[PDB]
Amino acid sequence: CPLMVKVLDAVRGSPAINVAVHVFRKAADDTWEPFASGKTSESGELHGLTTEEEFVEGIYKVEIDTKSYWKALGISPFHEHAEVVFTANDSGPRRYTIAALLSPYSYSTTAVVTNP
Amino acid sequence: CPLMVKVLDAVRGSPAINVAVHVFRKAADDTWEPFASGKTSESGELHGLTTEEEFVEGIYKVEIDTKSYWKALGISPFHEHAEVVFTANDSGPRRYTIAALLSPYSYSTTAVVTNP
Amino acid sequence: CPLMVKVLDAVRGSPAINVAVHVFRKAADDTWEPFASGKTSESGELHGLTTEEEFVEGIYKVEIDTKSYWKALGISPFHEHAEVVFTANDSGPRRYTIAALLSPYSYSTTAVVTNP
Amino acid sequence: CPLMVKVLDAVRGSPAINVAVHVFRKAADDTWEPFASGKTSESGELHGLTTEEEFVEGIYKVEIDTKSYWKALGISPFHEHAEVVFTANDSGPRRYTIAALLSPYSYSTTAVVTNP
After folding, report:
1. Chain breaks in chain B (C to N over 2.5 A) after
2. I need a surface site. Which of A29, A60, B5, C22 has the fewest CB within 10 A?
3. First and final CA of chain A: distance in angstroms?
4. What does R_g of chain A's alpha carbons equal in angstroms?
């Protein structure tokens, strides 16, 4: 499972559950082609987005629907989404964990990359 | 000066100097129209991006060229760039400061929205 | 396992392995009494610090030896350690996950708290 | 003004105003000796903590009373306070800005060390 996303809520001190995540891959014409998407689980994790074979080298964008999350809590959000844009697999397959920590007016993200 | 961007380096504990920043406004056709751009100063700040008359409500994207910053320092980066996507809403305060804290595999961003 | 600590490295994009973590509990005389300690595993996680019975209500301080971590990489660190000070279990047992993200001149921390 | 502290609120997207900040210097007996303190201004900043003549090399602790900030706003906080523990070293730049970004269950802190 070479791409995993984990999302946490800094207001409530919890996983961010049922958060939509879209992944895009930059196409030859410089547009963002849909690649994979899903929603975080009760643990704030989203597994099963892709497979080693599907996950070719390229520039990927992970877009996390932070706005819907805050609106369902009735808290005013600043951002439309949180983004994570990176080149993947250009030296062969790697496993990427993208973590995001959400506040209404801030987010932080980090990547953990391992070589299988 | 309703929009300011500030960028900091968490590896060296310094302003992030000469970082390219591009701002886009979402057009009616859902494309991103160039809006403003510049390079951070010696203080890590980019002032004078826009004026009150130009900065209307809407969805804006700030792209910060973090990869070029790191690669010139001889430190391997993860991201292509950092993004900040938000709605500018005339309700509430009128000056937006977008801050970004950079690490090779992580970033944090916050918005500070104030009157004077 | 009611107290877990996870530590990530924002420079290398990895778990922070073999990081020392000390936990203290504020004593009646306002000094910090040693409570539990350990080192993060290959996954950056430290489990097994305490048990429900040992982990009474009180004010706890988690001190993460960030300085040794950076010095073993030959990277100059700013902080002596990273701290996380909080009241625990004052409404009965809870499970606390303390996450920390380390850069040489910055750290971020968040807590996930669940009710067993 | 060799030491400045800046505090931001990630829930409301604002400076964190009237936040108590205490600075301590580690004494020879390993106790923390009061060194400087104050409250953040309307801009979230605390200037004038010390002078060049007073701020000698050594280990310093900055304690930021985050709990009092949140509890007065009617938002439940996790931490008792935030801490920043660091060595002041006269090698390298001479002005230290300690920034803290607050959320109820999280904080981020960075140091920016500059000359003018």
Report:
1. none
2. A29
3. 10
4. 14
Radius of gyration of chain C (CA): 14
Which residue of C22, C78, C106, C113 is the best one to mutate when testing the D interface, meaning the one whose CB has the most D CBs within 10 A? C78
Site from A24, A76, A80 to mutate, B interface, most B CB atoms within 10 angstroms: A80
**For D1-116, CATH number?**
2.60.40.180
Rounded to whole angstroms, the Cα distance separating B74 from B80 reads 15
Structure tokens at D86: 């660091």
Q: Quick check: C103 and B103 in contact, CB under 8 A?
A: yes
What's the gap in Å between the CA of D8 and the closest CA on chain A? Answer: 10
Residues of C in contact with B73 (CB under 8 A): none
3-state secondary structure (DSSP) of residue D53: coil
The answer to whether the Cβ–Cβ distance between A105 and D78 falls below 8 Å is no
> A24 forms bridges with which residues in the sheet?
A34, A61
- Sorted by sequence, the CB contacts under 8 Å of residue A109 that are 6+ apart come out as A82, A84, A98, A99, A100, A101, B106, B107, B108
* Interface touch A59/B78, C-beta < 8 Å: no
Cβ contacts (< 8 Å) between B44 and chain D: which residues? 112
d(CA B21, CA B46): 8
State yes or no: D45 annotated in a binding site: yes
C86: distance to nearest CA of chain D, Å? 4
Q: What CA–CA distance (Å, rounded) separates B39 from B15?
A: 12
Resolution in Å, one decimal, please.
1.2
A63-69, long-range: CB within 8 Å, 24+ apart, which pairs? A63/A21, A63/A22, A63/A23, A63/A24, A64/A5, A64/A7, A64/A19, A64/A20, A64/A21, A64/A100, A64/A102, A65/A19, A65/A20, A65/A21, A65/A22, A66/A19, A66/A102, A66/A107, A68/A19, A68/A20, A69/A9, A69/A16, A69/A19, A69/A102
Picking from A13, A78, A105, the nearest residue to D78 by CB comes out as A13
Q: Which residue reads 């050594």 in tokens?
A: D58
Residue pair B21/B64 in contact (Cβ under 8 Å)? The answer is yes
DSSP reduced 3-state for D116: coil
Which chain D residues contact residue A9 at CB under 8 A? 105
Q: Among partner residues B82, B105, B110, which is closest to A110 by beta-carbon distance?
A: B105
CA trace torsion D100, C31, C3, C81 (10° rounding): 40
Residue numbers in B near C66 (CB within 8 A): none
The subunits that touch chain C, with at least 3 C-beta pairs less than 8 Å apart, are A, B, D
Neighbouring C-beta atoms of residue D94, cutoff 10 Å: 13
